Amino acid sequence: GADGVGNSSGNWHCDSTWMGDRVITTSTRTWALPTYNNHLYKQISSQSGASNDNHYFGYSTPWGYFDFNRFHCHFSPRDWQRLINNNWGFRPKRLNFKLFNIQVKEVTQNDGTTTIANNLTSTVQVFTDSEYQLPYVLGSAHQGCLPPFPADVFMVPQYGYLTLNNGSQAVGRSSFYCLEYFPSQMLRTGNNFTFSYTFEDVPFHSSYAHSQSLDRLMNPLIDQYLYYLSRTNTPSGTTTQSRLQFSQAGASDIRDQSRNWLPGPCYRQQRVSKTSADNNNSEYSWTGATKYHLNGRDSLVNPGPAMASHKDDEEKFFPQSGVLIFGKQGSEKTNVDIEKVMITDEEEIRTTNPVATEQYGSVSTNLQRGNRQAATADVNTQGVLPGMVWQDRDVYLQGPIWAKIPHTDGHFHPSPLMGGFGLKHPPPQILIKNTPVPANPSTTFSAAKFASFITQYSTGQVSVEIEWELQKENSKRWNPEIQYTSNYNKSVNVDFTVDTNGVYSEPRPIGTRYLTRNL
Amino acid sequence: GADGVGNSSGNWHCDSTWMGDRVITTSTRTWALPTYNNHLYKQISSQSGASNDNHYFGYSTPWGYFDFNRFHCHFSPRDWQRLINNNWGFRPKRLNFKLFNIQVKEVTQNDGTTTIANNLTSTVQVFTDSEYQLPYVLGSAHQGCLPPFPADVFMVPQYGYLTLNNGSQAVGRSSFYCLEYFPSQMLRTGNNFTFSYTFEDVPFHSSYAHSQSLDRLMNPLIDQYLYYLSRTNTPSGTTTQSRLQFSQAGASDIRDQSRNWLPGPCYRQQRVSKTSADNNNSEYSWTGATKYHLNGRDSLVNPGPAMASHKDDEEKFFPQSGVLIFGKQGSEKTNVDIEKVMITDEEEIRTTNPVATEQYGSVSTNLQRGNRQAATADVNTQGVLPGMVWQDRDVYLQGPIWAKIPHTDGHFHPSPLMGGFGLKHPPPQILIKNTPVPANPSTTFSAAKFASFITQYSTGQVSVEIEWELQKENSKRWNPEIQYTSNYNKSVNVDFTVDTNGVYSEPRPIGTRYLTRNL
Amino acid sequence: LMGGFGLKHPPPQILIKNTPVPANPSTTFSAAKFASFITQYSTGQVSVEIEWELQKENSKRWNPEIQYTSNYNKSVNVDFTVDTNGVYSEPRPIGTRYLTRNL
């Protein structure tokens, strides 16, 4: 699209409509973009000394990108609630994007006095990496997505990436991608950039919780017909004499019943409690946390494989890195106290996946014989096994929406671990930069790189609309399901509202599983 | 319809489907019908002495009728919840009824031993009073409607009615309707009786609560332009000297602001509190309760005109007869203690209708002058006034569904007072009786009325399906609405479930207003 | 895991109940749940037919495969038969793998 200077390049679309089966969440926000790295690509690396587990090598670019991989960039409390309360599941189908009403300003810091003014002509160029030839950054839970609250103006993030490294230094194989080596489209004012995408058949996120659970799944009333090993030894006057007898598992017997499927896999996490007291006093934050390691650098295992966060009656506990944790609007960056964060809870799964903090089961160790007692041992890490079945990490309104499946020789069940939809070809990276403006050059020629540009930034609005599909409920469940509600009682502030000084804020994390489906 | 003896006259339909705009609740239950008044019509009257406010005269009939004027005869907790959580409103549209698989048994109490057996031939006759020529009983909150819970078998109520009376005695004008003077259709087994109805344009029951309220309705930011009387007298050195000055109502001024509409009407009720303590000790149950009176008999004013049950912070109180009160499954018939009942609460209205227990406003009494102070007085009964606006009593799952608008020269806004839909021509009364079976007659003729019949009753199932329309939500409300949920925490029994001895039970009354619409 | 075929949508559950039969009710009305029914049960036959597909053998295996046979020698009772008092009985569990395919 194209037009004039006194012509709005696009209108403001920010609705949300439900169609019974679909529902489209349109949404627009105003943004701003500075000139990063003063227009140059800069090489960047870990700090020489820095622990090995923390080295790196890569580049930062003068390019800034766009991102809305956060559910709340599309759903509004209320809306989300609608969804989350009457749908067995849902998934994204297609999207449409558009930047417009772009405007380029140029600040002038003459002595003690700045003065911003329109640089009409100068441009901002955009380009979408629709061929995925660029290090996909999104999906890395970074923060600089869209504001949950419309009215909020925002700054565009700067693109940076990482290649290979042998400590703080580069290794040859590492590649250096240059963003100008693409065909950016250049916008001036009166210019807009639209583009549209279509998702790929993915599974509806399961937005329901299970009423039955693996173990308790058969019918009480009837005993099976298969037998199991009831007792081993037997009374012989005073002493026992080994004599194995078997029984037919019934209701009273349950624990012993024969089955057909196994809980999901696991990778044991340390348990910490919301109650300061209980927790051993010391620094096992890193030392005790569950991790894995590549090329000799141990990394953390955050968002551990999807597994319930606490047994019955222990909402007080949680994994050291088995859950998602968001900050309460305002919460500072580092070492903030428990009271400043919102920890997610995944009890809803208990029913199928193991509890993060407790071992999977316990396999037998030795082979018993008359002169040898029967061994056994608990298992803290069980990789996928036939017959296992499980549930993936719920979603949360202010959580990630999707993530790119890495291009590898092999993947195994790609639901992104941080939760979300695992996409092979996700929404392409959208980039934006401000074509430089060489400030006054010298009369006599010089072949040096230009270094003195006009100080200036850009701004303008952006809009994103997405169509989601739904799987409606359908249970013959007689008694009421659970629903997500807002507290009745009076409060000094409404949830998901602007305070007295107009600061919007999300009180709690809102999950997705409320409706109840049987297993 | 018709067929044979070994042929099911109908199948069992008991589903419930939602179509986005409609939703059909089908429902079938098994029933039983005895032979009332041993087959005769009996004249009936108050007990000679009995307080005048309690006299009456009328008849009881050998006929039993059918009734489902209770929302839970169609909605199942869950279902109801669906409705109640995502709909600005709804109303009934049409219905279809069918009796079938009728079966007539005949008990034999030979000495110390009864023995029931099939009286194949004998019949049960049904007939619907589709011309409303019979005293419409339904709508009178009687109890003998359908079981909320399907699996429950039930007994059919007996038809009785009331005419005029001058104390315990009849007055001529009083009519005596005879049920045989209709054309009953006679069913034998293999016979079924279907019939269908269509409702009449009625208003969707408002199933939402108001976010604004009459008083607080204008915009804070701006002061009006109309002036009101700020002060009357004025400082004159030591003494005041009358000097009326006026102000322009603003935010701080609010109470004084000029408006455009008035709260609904009222009829003051006594306030009682759920807290035994507070309540004055004595018997003002009748003496103090709000009532009205015709032909010299004071009757009670139950379900008073629709008006909020308590101001902010007083959920502890309520009208003496301004609310609906249901029994907790089991609760005996008389003088049962507060702990045995469930009292409905209509706070949701506060916003438009007056509070039941507190006066409407206060009008001025006298005309003031120098030598006369300004009078004023509170008003406890305000009949409809121009500009008044209000809300009708909510509904409740186990509440009435509708009621017949009395045939009179004049009605005023017919939403039935007990709540529900006010119908001009409601679902016709359906009646049923068992054609008598003269037990062995004497060889020699006698012209006396037959008095010795075969002892026998009937049974068989009945089905009712109804189509309801809906008005879906649609508010730009950002923050979450309130929804109806079931408690998370463990409990010895699930709500709306059968206990250990299979006794279904409704824990609490469930209203209808949860979703929030602005005023 | 107990072995068998894993089905996503298996043969639907089939249910059956006997519509109750309220035994003699009282002349005067009562809104209580009916509790006195006619004592009675049902009976009748049921039939199930199923079509199974097969994958026939096909090995160039020269020497004889193993097969499932019934013992030659005399016995007081035939296997999978009714005893003297007509009580059918399955002597042993019979598997499925007998024919031999290469890996």
Swiss-Prot record, chain C:
Compartments it resides in: Virion; Host nucleus, Host nucleolus
Uses in biotechnology: AAV capsids serve as viral gene transfer vectors that have been shown to affect long-term gene expression and disease correction with low toxicity in animal models, and are well tolerated in human clinical trials.
Domain writeup: The N-terminus of VP1 is sequestered within the mature capsid. It contains a phospholipase A2-like region and putative nuclear localization signals.
Other noteworthy facts: The ratio at which VP1, VP2 and VP3 proteins are synthesized in vivo is about 1:1:10, which is the same as in the mature virus particle.
Task of the protein: Capsid protein self-assembles to form an icosahedral capsid with a T=1 symmetry, about 22 nm in diameter, and consisting of 60 copies of three size variants of the capsid protein VP1, VP2 and VP3 which differ in their N-terminus. The capsid encapsulates the genomic ssDNA. Binds to host cell heparan sulfate and uses host ITGA5-ITGB1 as coreceptor on the cell surface to provide virion attachment to target cell. This attachment induces virion internalization predominantly through clathrin-dependent endocytosis.
Record family assignment: Belongs to the parvoviridae capsid protein family.
Name this polypeptide is given: Capsid protein VP1
Organism: Adeno-associated virus 2 (isolate Srivastava/1982) (AAV-2)
Classification lineage: Viruses, Monodnaviria, Shotokuvirae, Cossaviricota, Quintoviricetes
Gene name per UniProt: VP1
